Amino acid sequence: EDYSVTLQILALMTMLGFLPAMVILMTSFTRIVVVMSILRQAMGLQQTPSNQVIIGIALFLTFFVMSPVLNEINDKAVQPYLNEQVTAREAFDAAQAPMKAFMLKQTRIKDLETFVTMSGEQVDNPEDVSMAVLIPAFITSELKTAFQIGFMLFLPFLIIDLVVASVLMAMGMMMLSPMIVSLPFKLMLFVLVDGWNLILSTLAGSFA
Amino acid sequence: EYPTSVVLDWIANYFWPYVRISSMLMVMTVTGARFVSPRIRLYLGLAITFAVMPAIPAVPQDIELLSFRGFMTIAEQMIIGIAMGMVTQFMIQTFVLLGQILGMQSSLLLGQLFMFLTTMFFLATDGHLKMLQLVVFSFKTLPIGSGSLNAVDFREMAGWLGIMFQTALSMSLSGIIALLTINLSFGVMTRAAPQLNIFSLGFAFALMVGLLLCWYILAGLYSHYEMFWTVGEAQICRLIRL
Amino acid sequence: DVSLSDVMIARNKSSVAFDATVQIRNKLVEAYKDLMNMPV
Amino acid sequence: ASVLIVGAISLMWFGEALARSLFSIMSRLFDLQREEIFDTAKLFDIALGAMTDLLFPLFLVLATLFTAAMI
């Protein structure tokens, strides 16, 4: 009944091939990158942080926030499987469940309702919905949540820029572009409040 | 003896240390550059692992090469290597951040000028040698078998974005104030006649001073790099628990 | 004390083990390279 | 010439309070809880609250510019 060693290896290599998809569609990678995309866009820098470090910080942030779920998968699924306590079929299910639970904690009821009706299936409990339908609902909630956080992050930088523009216009110099003057002030206020540490607390802790 | 034990151990005792070494190289500033071919980088990783082999302690024999536990070992060797590599990328891109903030404030590619010079700083200060010394030390204090980056290491590495802005602003605060005060002084002094304005005339004036200020920035940039490297090196040792 | 069966089994086990660790290393690196080259 | 000078003079004292105003807005809008993020109405309330709290210090500085301009 249990999959043979040859077939289990084939399944293992298959999931490694789809590993980039699982990061950007099932884990918290999508929300972090979108929020960090807003932060770069909000400040006057266009490509200054560069794409490489943002993804690298996002990957490390995901491993931080996915550590509880990854450890739960390790304990429940990997440990019985390594010790040959359980078969491969049930070990795979034991690993799938923590991922499903985490995606439910970061989704909305309205999003699930739309896709479960879209799939044209019958279900009564959100806890046993197929992962094929949970994934589109999860990322849709993630994109909406990220836009909410990004909108809140965009407001203080908009506040600073509007104040500087008003001050320059009030002083009478209708000739100077507000962006050049406002950029150091936005950066200074981003540093002396330790903005990134605050963003870490409101982003890593946003999942719970 | 049964020859299986001898052959399997060497592959386990070589490839697993090599994976961590190779993973650091592909993310490293110099060895992970686009100029070098993968083949040259591959041979460098092979040669480094062979040479530093005596200093690497023997891996535990409990974990088998063909087992899921051995598969996890390969992944966690890469994570350690990428951790060191990303730190080096963080420093250089922070100088790229320093170049672009000056260029943006200069009414204006200037990041490349700082990126190239910072790469020279990395090479001249033997930064590549120190990183290689760090990864071999990682084998001692962070053994291959038992050990991996914890959650705290991920959070510390994720908090380096604030390190970038604070360090970049600290380097440019004196220059950026100079850029603002001359532009504000130019604005107020020419505000008497609204016929002149600045527009493109202000573009020319701003960029000439901005290039001149970058000349001042390069005059005292080395001291900032030395302090920055100490912060980065301390983070790396924290990852490897040294 | 050893025979050709042990030598051949040792050779085959080493070849399978070496091929296993190389491909998994290749898969993980390709996964890493795909993540790095994405539009932020 | 006089208007810009008084604005700089105002930025000496009013600017420090304006810096405090900007400090509070950034600190609050960055420190969000799970309940605040998931509620759209609460986000707009803080957006209005941060908006209005900005207006009072900004109005004083611009008034200091206007008063000297007439004089």
Added chain:
Amino acid sequence: GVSQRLEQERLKLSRERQLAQAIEEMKQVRKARVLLALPEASASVFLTLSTGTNLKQQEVDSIVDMVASAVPGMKTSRITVTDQHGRLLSSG
């Protein structure tokens, strides 16, 4: 000067007040207060009856049914009914 939580609280307060006003019209009741807990939901109703008199099983059952069906959630098995004398009339 309104907000998110405050408005929902005021809606709950309006519900409580209209529930009390509806309860007052019962002959045996002189004063009524209702408290709600809507996030499972729950309810708690306090009464001051006439100068004496006791509410029967029929009266308290009618009261708890009305309270439960007036508010969404709070199934009829999760309301506490008390009175001036302090006699308990339902579980919770």
Added chain:
Amino acid sequence: VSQRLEQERLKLSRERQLAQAIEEMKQVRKARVLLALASASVFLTLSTGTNLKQQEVDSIVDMVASAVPGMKTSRITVTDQHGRLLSSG
């Protein structure tokens, strides 16, 4: 208004309304309700004489638990002006 302050003020309003409801009983003169957020603690200064029977305190704790979401009835501690315990936590 701060979020935490909003939560605390909602809790305080709920506790005050519960106390006002409690004062309607003849037996008690003044009451103060405190919450733990899932637990409750009702501290009462009773009337001149009389003692609260287990029935009356049972009704009181039942109403208090049914007033707040969660905090099942087994985790509410009741004392009096002399401090006699009526319920375990």
Added chain:
Amino acid sequence: GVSQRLEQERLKLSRERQLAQAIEEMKQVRKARVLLALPASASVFLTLSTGTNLKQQEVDSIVDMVASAVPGMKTSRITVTDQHGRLLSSG
């Protein structure tokens, strides 16, 4: 304005003051000052009446009320003392 940790400390202080007011009605107790430690732990100092010694039943009732008043801090994590220095609950 209002700082985060400062706000939390203000909330703890409010809880301690309201607990002290709650204890004030005790016939045996004249003043009480409580200090808390969220992770929980608590330590309450008392100045009783002129004489009198608090019974085990009374102190148990007080400690159960205290533990039910603040989330966490299971009832065995409170140290209750008085002016004279006699312990009434282990920690």
Added chain:
Amino acid sequence: GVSQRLEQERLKLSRERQLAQAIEEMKQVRKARVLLALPEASASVFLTLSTGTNLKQQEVDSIVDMVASAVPGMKTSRITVTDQHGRLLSSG
């Protein structure tokens, strides 16, 4: 304005001040000073008592137990109790 480290130190000082004020009401002791060390957490208590008297082991034990319970961590075996005269009262 004030930074994070200073705020933590000021919170520790406020805790020590309120603990000392709580201690002052005791019959035997006259004045107390508490020092804390929070990263294992450590504590130190210094007391000048009444004109005479020596504290029995119960009194110092109650003091140290209340102190340990007051501050997070710092199990009751990690506080040193001293006095003006220089007599030692506990380990650590």
Added chain:
Amino acid sequence: VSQRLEQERLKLSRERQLAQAIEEMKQVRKARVLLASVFLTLSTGTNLKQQEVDSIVDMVASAVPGMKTSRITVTDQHGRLLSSG
């Protein structure tokens, strides 16, 4: 001021408060502790007993998150050493 100066000032505050606490001792007139090496000016005469210095070293060890008791040196006006390190 940032980081190192902040930590140094905090250590200075610890030294000042420990010295103030030690001032209450009957025998000792003045205290100065370097973060450790602790030098005390005692009364006009007198010599410290073993119990006194043992209490002092235990208090100092419990004050700072470190400095295991065995690593404290205690001196006085006449220059006698009371504990190794």
Added chain:
Amino acid sequence: FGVSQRLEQERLKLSRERQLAQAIEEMKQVRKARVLLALPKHSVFVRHNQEASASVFLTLSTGTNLKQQEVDSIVDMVASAVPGMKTSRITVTDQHGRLLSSG
């Protein structure tokens, strides 16, 4: 402001010397003290550290002499004052220049 790392470190160590010198002023025997420290960096990348050291110059009273007790007490106090730099690495000198400790 304007002080960069290394300089700051000196402004620490030198100041310590002063207060340690201060600690030696209250001694009956010593009139004036000046402590010299030699603190290298950990430098994990170099396998040979030259290790810390100390040398203390004291102007004593008009007379008085110390046989072994006072010098040993002082050298231990100084050694425990500065992190690392174990007690055997302090040289003590006086106004008369008689050798008091090796290092």
Added chain:
Amino acid sequence: FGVSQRLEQERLKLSRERQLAQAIEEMKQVRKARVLLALPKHSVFVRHNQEASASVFLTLSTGTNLKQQEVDSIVDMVASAVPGMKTSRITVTDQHGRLLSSG
């Protein structure tokens, strides 16, 4: 501001040399002292490592002759003052120019 690292090291050396000279001033036999240091390289290869050294000039009192104990005490203080500079490499001379220590 603007000084390069080498100049920073030189200024630190000047400060330490000045304070060492001041310390040697208080010696009864010593009237004036001038100090010179020589920085190391710390290379693993024996053919390239250099190590530190010192060169100190003393203007003594009008009379008096230095004893071997005196010069040994001076060189020990110098060696312990600055990290490295093992006693073997310290050159000390006098006003009349007699050799007191080799480098």
